[PDB]
Write a protein that binds this ligand. Structure first.
Ligand code: CLA
Ligand code: CLA
Ligand code: CLA
Ligand code: CLA
Ligand code: CLA
Ligand code: CLA
Ligand code: CLA
Ligand code: CLA
Ligand code: CLA
Ligand SMILES: CC1=C(/C=C/C(C)=C/C=C/C(C)=C/C=C/C=C(C)/C=C/C=C(C)/C=C/C2=C(C)CCCC2(C)C)C(C)(C)CCC1
Ligand code: SF4
Lengths: 63, 39, 82, 82, 733, 141, 80, 29, 151
């Protein structure tokens, strides 16, 4: 997966930050974890949350 | 004093002063060049 | 809080009909000019007793009739009220 | 009531002078709001009822109104400080 | 389901009063009933259409029957200018003597109502002359009603049930409707105008018992097949022709004269005949375009699939649209309603300016009634079009099968569309309100010369190009040396130019700054209403606040107080909000029309021209003035024939405000209140012996929105109708 | 593990209100909540008013399950006391409701089988057209 | 009754369960998340549809979803 | 005026009574 | 003239409006001592009024049958002051405001707490970005061609 602190684009359609960018905090190495990629964002969502878990196919490392 | 200046830079105070200045300007302009319908 | 919210509308309603009551009653049966020998001419000539008994009476003899001053106040000192 | 009114004139003739204690500046045509309230004065007719209070209190001059104004301002200062 | 509603056991198992309400409210939403299929859907829709037709025919027959039985149709055809058309008699045992005396108008021997539907002018124009004609037409339409019901029942039966495939045969239905329903009907109507209407206007009584014995033309049928069609236009009616009489009558049957018959102030019957004939031909030729069972013709699927521009600026173009339309009845209903709404407004706009009925347009109240009627109908129809729009987007739209086409691409840049609609509305609002308020302040301060009065140069220029000479722009049809003017100088231009420069009719009325302002108000209305509706349609499947909205359907209460709060988030709610803006918009347009026309008919357009530039003018000189007679329908001194409209005026106000009740206060309050009432009932002796079978509950959130909107709309319509009719008929212009 | 038995224990001290049971308790269903209090003490009634819970076993009949979990929540949160509640039908039958398996649902406990759990993210639900003319919803898959 | 669903984006914070006023949800063992637990809705017959659970859920998008469905005397919150 | 005295109370009083009673029984079943 | 209108300097109703206005003002003026403040005020209103009508006549305004100035916005070169010019001026000022605001928002976008400087204005920064608006067409035109205007 992507490194820690990596700038990634959100591919999950139902996400508040969909088509936007966030920063990787940590990736769970447990292969049973369905959404390992922990991401933190610059702006909060409608639930006042600034962090969310995603899968490997839901992030796109860009720069 | 720095805190007071910071307060004077807050949104509502800034708006009161800015729109106050604008109101004054438009008033004086409309006093010197009154009844303007053209230009 | 939402009950305060609805209660506000109803308070507005009540007070509105109260002040309308006062206005019409005063202009109709109390206020007005007085002629010599004691002849009293009221502002709306005592129509209350016969007019305020239908909604149409309030619609026409109160609201419609008395809104005249406000709606033609333009071009005068009362224009701010229009 | 002391500086921008027709109070003394009103004292001279309360029955045929309209109480006024607000005057507007002459810009953008709002000067029209200064109407003929009587007493050789042009302004906005007030409906607060201050003139009748002042007459009831025995006030006759604008000077006394000025003094009461100063007193009230002082009291404002005192309440704020308090 | 074991109880009502039988089409939904989900609602049927509801122990509360809701069960009833929703039962009534979801009765026609076939797609959401239990155990439904495409077949049952189409078949029920078909039968329902037959039912609707039957209701229409029965309604019309009722109108004909009542005019014939209780009206003064004959007295009217003898003197259309000085007779008020009777709609029907009235028998109300609640009436007092003054009411009975007051409502006895016309030549009636009792209380009646005066028709403002304008059926008299219509029926008289097309050929009806006696009560007997009306009776026979009523019987015939009753027969059509029975036939339609019979057809619904028939096609519901297993022998006559059509398959879904048949319903999906688009090309055939298009061919048949274009050629037959549009073409043959219009040709046949031209037939009626030629055989009955035109002779009737010339003073010739032509009916079924003699129409085979009478020549519609002196040398009939020859010139048609000869190609000497011009002979049918040889001598039209004279300019001093009197309608219904032989005096001044010609013999032509098909002309393009233009303008109005000077006496009746309406279009020429020969012009209308030629019109219907011509369009009948265009329809008939156009009806042979699509392929059926004869090896020739176009394939709509292929046509759509071929219209994709190389370069990909429209993606895959229209590929797949055939199926996504032909499979989704909601898409079809959206297109249908959109077009129907547009042409309904078109009907209003063309019928007020170019009346086709004899001695209408002299009837001011009828004209106003008709315009307002059709404009409100058009409004509702439009909102509905935009309502079945998103139902498609939710229930039917298949994203994968529409990959990269115009529709999917439409959903792609939805934010752009919505934001630009928002900009347009915002601009128009700021500046129209701004200019109005400016002018009002100028009027207040006694300086109307400082008003900002923008002249409608563009529309005036269009009028000039159309041949109006008031603004003196001298363009095209107003320019004496223009080729456009020379082209039809010897055809329709005489009558037309004569009509467009006769400033006593409504053909291209003269316009000033007031017209500019109110037109921009109308622009604001259209743009904003479309903002609500379009935004509601595009976000019907989801948004960032609710990405899975499609999983909840077209209508739902909300998504909860979480995430900041989600009230009025469904597409249905978007519609519901849009209705207010439609009512507002049509309010403005009908206000405009009615005021301008009342000032026209009164003989002082300067009233409108000066007062419409500021909103105090609309309030005082339009609303406040024209209610004088209305509010005096009944008073402490007595009553007259306007008491109905005063009572209806107040009725509308009341219903409107009750609407406000349902719209402002929401559910929980009422639910708890009702709980205390339930306790009250269970603890009150004697009354204890009586108990409910359906638990009393407060109306639902959505139900509340609907009921509120309904009271609001009804109040709106009834109030404005009462004002319109009373103000207009109280003076008759 | 076997659920708790439901005997006839004394009810809290209360003067009675108008927020108690109605006909629903007689014809449909009512509810019963039991708890064990260290002492006599005042508590606010879910149906309005103040009552006194006795020391030892207490049994209170309410009209709704929500009232039961509300009162119980106030008990565990304020008075640090464990509670249980059951549903009761007119025929006499009693159904043990809460806590179902002896452990509060907030904390995990082995033995519970999943109900209504979709092993897929919420955005991957099929469009309504995929389930047209079926009895299925996009979230039932 | 109303319908309540749990999706695998659940991180087992248990916030929804302790938010329900009618005891509808519960936590069961799971391996898909670090918390070793996932939500579940075995008692939706007692569900009123208030959506406090959805307002308590931290995930984006929601891992608990309430689809208001067939209306019963329990779901209407009636006490009569 | 003859027929209206028959049909008006028929449609205004009898018909809605019959219809409301019928619909009531239907919906309550 | 344009749209069948008549020039205000040649309009009879325009003049009659001026007449009635001045006469109303004088009719009100009759009740006050000539040296008093109300008199000077009403007289000031009269002079301002006639100066207004005279200026409108001089400006080449067209009047309707109402006797009021109507505006020509078609682009007609005899009336560019009736919409075109003040329109250009407006667009210039609005562009100034928007461009300055944009500059300010961009300037604080990359910071620890951007929202802070949105509720508490950085007056030094604002004063620095204030005059940049003077050249907003040039600045925006170049950013348009460069690709720094959109993303
Ligand atoms: C805030 C904006 C503003 C601006 C740009 C001006 C500008 C001006 N004012 Mg001032 N004025 C203002 C606010 C302003 N004023 C306010 C808020 C008051 C009330 C205290 C005044 C009261 C005032 C008076 C009494 C006079 C001016 C005058 C002037 C002019 C002096 C040269 C100049 C155009 C002078 C002038 O030229 O009057 C004709 C003058 O006599 N002003
Ligand atoms: C929203 C549309 C709108 C528009 C286009 C106007 C336009 C105008 N109004 Mg109106 N007004 C409006 C809304 C509007 N107003 C509203 C909503 C109200 C109610 C509050 C008013 C109440 C009002 C009054 C009471 C008066 C006006 C006046 C005016 C005129 C003033 C001319 C002027 O300011 O000198 C020119 C101004 C400038 C050149 C300003 C720019 C200065 C900068 C520093 C230039 C920088 C260049 C570098 C102008 C035609 C006056 C008038 O005479 O009417 C004919 C007037 O007395 N307005
Ligand atoms: C569309 C409805 C319609 C119908 C049912 C009729 C029917 C009739 N017309 Mg009328 N007519 C119509 C429209 C219609 N017309 C229109 C639109 C015009 C304006 C051009 C006229 C102008 C007109 C004149 C001037 C005359 C008639 C006459 C007649 C009668 C003689 C028919 C005949 O012998 O034709 C010939 C029979 C044929 C079979 C040839 C026509 C076949 C057509 C062209 C093709 C049909 C398509 C095919 C079925 C597929 C008959 C009652 C005549 C009459 O004496 O009235 C009593 C007569 O002189 N019509
Ligand atoms: C071509 C015409 C047409 C057809 C065939 C349909 C068909 C449908 N519509 Mg659509 N729609 C239309 C036009 C049409 N509509 C128009 C013109 C509008 C704008 C108003 C809409 C706006 C609309 C919405 C918002 C919705 C529909 C829905 C539906 C579906 C269910 C309808 C139902 O069961 O209601 C049941 C019938 C009622 C509840 C009674 C209707 C009577 C109303 C409330 C007014 C009655 C007031 C009365 C006149 C007052 C008396 C006055 C007196 C006291 C003086 C059905 C497929 C629904 C749907 O299923 O979408 C998925 C839905 O939610 N339509
Ligand atoms: C007369 C009452 C009224 C007014 C003025 C509005 C105005 C508006 N509505 Mg509508 N709305 C109304 C009733 C009203 N609504 C009702 C009854 C409903 C049914 C619930 C709706 C439902 C509705 C929907 C669904 C939508 C709107 C939208 C809009 C905006 C449309 C764009 C526009 O014209 O911008 C022009 C702006 C105005 C007309 C507002 C006036 C702004 C003033 C003049 C400027 C400030 C003046 C002054 C400086 C303020 C001093 C105040 C002081 C205390 C500081 C506009 C703000 C749409 C929208 O938001 O689009 C962007 C939209 O989608 N409304
Ligand atoms: C003007 C429209 C309107 C009307 C008619 C009502 C009526 C009512 N509201 Mg109100 N309400 C309104 C606007 C209105 N509201 C608005 C805008 C809001 C938002 C603030 C509210 C918010 C609100 C609250 C918070 C409350 C009410 C309550 C009430 C009820 C008070 C009890 C009562 O007097 O019953 C008597 C009924 C009337 C006075 C209505 C007219 C009765 C007619 C004349 C009888 C007709 C005879 C017969 C039925 C005709 C049938 C014919 C048919 C068969 C063909 C009453 C039904 C209160 C309530 O429910 O207390 C019990 C209450 O607490 N409303
Ligand atoms: C369809 C449109 C229509 C409408 C709106 C009216 C309206 C009226 N009729 Mg008329 N009527 C009609 C058609 C219509 N009629 C037809 C086609 C006939 C010939 C049979 C009659 C024969 C008739 C007589 C003899 C009288 C009236 C009278 C009246 C007035 C009082 C109502 C009444 O008692 O009539 C009753 C109507 C009937 C008995 C005939 C209708 C039967 C049809 C076939 C079925 C209608 C079912 C209907 C659509 C269901 C709607 C309700 C449902 C949606 C819940 C009222 C103005 C009375 C009057 O004029 O008083 C001044 C009166 O005395 N009507
Ligand atoms: C739309 C149909 C309709 C019709 C035809 C009537 C007719 C009548 N109403 Mg009205 N009414 C109606 C709807 C209608 N109503 C509605 C919707 C409301 C609520 C808004 C009212 C509210 C109302 C009131 C408050 C009163 C009336 C009264 C009347 C009577 C007029 C007064 C009179 O002098 O008669 C003379 C009447 C008599 C000499 C006595 C009548 C005795 C009747 C005919 C015996 C019938 C018995 C029979 C079993 C009825 C069963 C019918 C049922 C099975 C369908 C008249 C019979 C007045 C009344 O009833 O007076 C007694 C009266 O006070 N009405
Ligand atoms: C309704 C749409 C519409 C639009 C968008 C315009 C736009 C314009 N008009 Mg036009 N106008 C219109 C309708 C319209 N007009 C109508 C209906 C009439 C009555 C016939 C006029 C009468 C009119 C006159 C007399 C003049 C304009 C002029 C202008 C231009 C302003 C000057 C300029 O742009 O600077 C510079 C111009 C350009 C860079 C090119 C504009 C000219 C080309 C050929 C287009 C502008 C392009 C002026 C103009 O065109 O000056 C050159 C001008 O003198 N208009
Ligand atoms: C939502 C939705 C929908 C709907 C939509 C809508 C509803 C729309 C509307 C629309 C509309 C409503 C449109 C309109 C249009 C119009 C037009 C397009 C017009 C045109 C015109 C013209 C073209 C003309 C021209 C002319 C002139 C002007 C003059 C002279 C003559 C002539 C002819 C030349 C659908 C279902 C689809 C699907 C999807 C979803
Ligand atoms: S909706 Fe309210 S009740 Fe139904 S589950 Fe979520 S929280 Fe528990």
């Amino acid at each position: 997966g992507p490194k820690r602190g990596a700038k990634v684009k959100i591919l999950r359609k139902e996400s508040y930050w969909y088509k936007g960018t966030g920063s990787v905090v940590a990736v769970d190495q447990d292969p049973n974890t369905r959404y390992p990629v922990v991401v933190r964002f610059n702006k909060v969502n409608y639930a006042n949350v600034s962090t969310n878990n995603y899968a490997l196919d839901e992030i796109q490392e860009v720069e | 004093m720095r805190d007071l200046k910071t307060y004077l830079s807050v949104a509502p105070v800034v708006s009161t002063l800015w729109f106050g200045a604008l109101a004054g300007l438009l008033i004086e302009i409309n006093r010197f060049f009154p009844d303007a319908l053209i230009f | 809080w939402d009950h305060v919210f609805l209660g506000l509308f109803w308070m507005y309603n009540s007070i509105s009909v109260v002040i309308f009551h006062f206005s019409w009653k005063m202009q109709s049966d109390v206020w007005g000019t007085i002629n010599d020998q004691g002849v009293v001419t009221h502002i709306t000539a005592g129509n209350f007793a016969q007019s305020s008994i239908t909604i149409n009476g309030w619609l026409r003899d109160f609201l419609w009739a008395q809104a005249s001053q406000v709606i033609q106040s333009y071009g005068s000192s009362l224009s701010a009220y229009g | 009531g002391a500086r921008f009114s027709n109070y003394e004139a009103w004292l001279n003739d309360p029955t045929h002078i309209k109480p006024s204690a607000q005057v507007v500046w002459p810009i953008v045509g709002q000067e029209i709001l200064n109407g003929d309230v009587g007493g050789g004065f042009r302004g906005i007719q007030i409906t607060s009822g201050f003139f009748q209070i002042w007459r009831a209190s025995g006030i006759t001059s604008e000077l006394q109104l000025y003094c009461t104004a100063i007193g009230a301002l002082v009291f404002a200062g005192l309440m704020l400080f308090a | 389901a074991l109880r009502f509603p039988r089409f939904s056991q989900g609602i049927a198992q509801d122990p509360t009063t809701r069960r009833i309400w929703f039962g009534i409210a979801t009765a026609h939403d076939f797609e959401s009933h239990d155990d439904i299929t495409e077949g049952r859907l189409y078949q029920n829709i078909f039968a329902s259409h037959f039912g609707q037709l039957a209701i229409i025919f029965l309604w019309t027959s009722g109108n004909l029957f009542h005019v014939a039985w209780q009206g003064n149709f004959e007295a009217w055809v003898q003197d259309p200018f000085h007779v008020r058309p009777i709609a029907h008699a009235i028998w109300d045992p609640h009436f007092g003597q003054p009411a009975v005396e007051a409502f006895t108008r016309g030549g009636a021997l009792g209380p009646v109502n005066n028709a403002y539907s304008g059926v008299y002018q219509w029926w008289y124009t097309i050929g009806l002359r006696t009560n007997e004609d009306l009776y026979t037409g009523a019987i015939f339409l009753l027969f059509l009603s029975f036939i339609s019901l019979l057809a619904g029942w028939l096609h519901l039966q297993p022998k006559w049930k059509p398959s879904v495939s048949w319903f999906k045969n688009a090309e055939s239905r298009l061919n048949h409707h274009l050629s037959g329903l549009f073409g043959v009907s219009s040709l046949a109507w031209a037939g009626h105008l030629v055989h009955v209407a035109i002779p009737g206007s010339r003073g010739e009584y032509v009916r079924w018992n003699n129409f085979l014995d009478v020549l519609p033309h002196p040398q009939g049928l020859g010139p048609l097949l000869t190609g000497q069609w011009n002979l049918y236009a040889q001598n039209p009616s004279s300019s001093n022709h009197l309608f219904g009489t032989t005096q001044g009558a010609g013999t032509a049957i098909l002309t393009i004269l233009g303008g109005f018959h000077p006496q009746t102030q309406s279009l020429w019957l020969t012009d209308m005949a030629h019109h219907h004939l011509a369009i009948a031909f265009l329809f008939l030729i156009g009806g042979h375009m699509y392929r059926t069972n004869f090896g020739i013709g176009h394939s709509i699927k292929y046509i759509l699939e071929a219209h994709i521009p190389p370069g990909g600026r429209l993606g895959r173009g229209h590929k797949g649209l055939y199926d996504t339309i032909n499979n989704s009845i909601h898409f079809q209903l959206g297109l249908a309603l959109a077009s129907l709404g547009v042409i309904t407004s078109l009907v209003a706009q063309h019928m007020y300016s170019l009346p086709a009925y004899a001695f209408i347009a002299q009837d001011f109240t009828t004209q106003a009634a008709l315009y307002t009627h059709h404009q409100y109908i058009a409004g509702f129809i439009m909102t509905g079009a935009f309502a079945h729009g998103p139902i498609f987007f939710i229930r039917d739209y298949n994203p994968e099968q529409n990959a990269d086409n115009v529709l999917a691409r439409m959903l792609e840049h939805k934010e752009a569309i919505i934001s630009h609609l928002s900009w347009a509305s915002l601009f128009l609002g700021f500046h129209t309100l701004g200019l109005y308020v400016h002018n009002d302040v100028m009027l207040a301060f006694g300086t109307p010369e400082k008003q900002i009065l923008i002249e409608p140069i563009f529309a005036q220029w269009i009028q000039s190009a159309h041949g109006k000479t008031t603004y003196g722009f001298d363009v095209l049809l107003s320019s004496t040396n223009g080729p456009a003017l020379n082209a039809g100088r010897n055809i329709w231009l005489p009558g037309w130019l004569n009509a467009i420069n006769e400033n006593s009719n409504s053909l291209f009325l003269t316009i000033g700054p007031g017209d500019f302002l109110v037109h921009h108000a109308i622009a604001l209305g259209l743009h904003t209403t479309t903002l609500i509706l379009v935004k509601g349609a595009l976000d019907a499947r989801g948004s960032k606040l609710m990405p899975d909205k499609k999983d909840f359907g077209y209508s739902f209460p909300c998504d909860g107080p979480g995430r900041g709060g989600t009230c009025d988030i469904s597409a249905w709610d978007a519609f519901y909000l849009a209705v207010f803006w439609m009512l507002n918009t049509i309010g403005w347009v009908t206000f405009y029309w009615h005021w301008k026309h009342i000032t026209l008919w009164r003989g002082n357009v300067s009233q409108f021209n000066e007062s419409s530039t500021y909103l105090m003018g609309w309030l005082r000189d339009y609303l406040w003035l024209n209610s004088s007679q209305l509010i005096n329908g009944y008073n402490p001194f007595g009553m007259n024939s306007l008491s109905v409209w005063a009572w209806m005026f107040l009725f509308g106000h009341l219903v409107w405000a009750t609407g406000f009740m349902f719209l402002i206060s929401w559910r929980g309050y009422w639910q708890e209140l009702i709980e205390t009432l339930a306790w009250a009932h269970e603890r009150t002796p004697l009354a204890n012996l009586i108990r409910w079978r359906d638990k009393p509950v407060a109306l639902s959130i959505v139900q509340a929105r609907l009921v509120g909107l309904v009271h609001f709309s009804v109040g709106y319509i009834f109030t404005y109708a009462a004002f319109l009719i009373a103000s207009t008929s109280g003076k008759f212009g | 593990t076997p659920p708790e038995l439901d005997p006839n224990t004394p009810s809290p001290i209360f003067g009675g209100s108008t927020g108690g049971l109605l006909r629903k308790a007689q014809v449909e269903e009512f509810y019963v909540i039991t708890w064990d209090s260290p002492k006599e003490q005042i508590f606010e009634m879910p149906t309005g008013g103040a009552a006194i819970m006795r020391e030892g076993p207490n049994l209170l009949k309410l009209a709704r399950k929500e009232q039961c979990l509300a009162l119980g929540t106030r008990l565990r949160s304020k008075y640090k006391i464990k509670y249980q509640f059951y549903r009761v039908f007119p025929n006499g039958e009693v159904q043990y409701l809460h806590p179902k398996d002896g452990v509060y649902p907030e904390k995990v406990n082995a033995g519970r089988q999943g109900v209504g759990q979709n092993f897929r993210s919420i955005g991957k639900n099929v469009s309504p057209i995929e389930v047209k003319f079926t009895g299925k919803q996009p979230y039932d898959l | 009754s109303h319908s309540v669903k749990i999706y695998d984006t659940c991180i087992g914070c248990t916030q929804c369960v302790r938010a329900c006023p009618t005891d509808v949800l519960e936590m069961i063992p799971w391996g898909g998340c670090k918390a070793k637990q996932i939500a579940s809705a075995p008692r939706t017959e007692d569900c009123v549809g208030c959506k406090r659970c959805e307002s308590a859920c931290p995930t984006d998008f929601l891992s608990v979803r309430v689809y208001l469905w067939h209306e019963t005397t329990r779901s209407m919150g009636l006490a009569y | 005026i003859n027929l209206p005295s028959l049909f008006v109370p028929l449609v205004g009083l009898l018909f809605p009574a019959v219809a409301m009673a019928s619909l009531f029984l239907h919906v309550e079943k | 003239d344009i749209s069948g209108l008549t020039p205000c300097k040649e309009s009879k109703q325009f003049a009659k409006r001026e007449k009635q206005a001045l006469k109303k003002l004088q009719a009100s003026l009759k009740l006050y001592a000539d040296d008093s403040a109300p008199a000077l005020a009403i007289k000031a209103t009269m002079e301002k009024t006639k100066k207004r009508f005279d200026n409108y006549g001089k400006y080449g305004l067209l009047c309707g049958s109402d006797g009021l100035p109507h505006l020509i916005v078609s682009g007609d070169q005899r009336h560019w002051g009736e919409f075109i010019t003040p329109g250009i001026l407006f667009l210039y000022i609005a562009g100034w405001i928007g461009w300055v605001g944009r500059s300010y928002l961009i300037a604080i976008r990359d910071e620890k707490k951007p929202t802070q400087k949105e509720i508490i204005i950085d007056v030094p920064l604002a004063s620095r970005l204030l005059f940049r608006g003077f050249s907003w067409p040039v600045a925006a035109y170049r950013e348009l061609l460069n690709g720094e205007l959109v993303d």
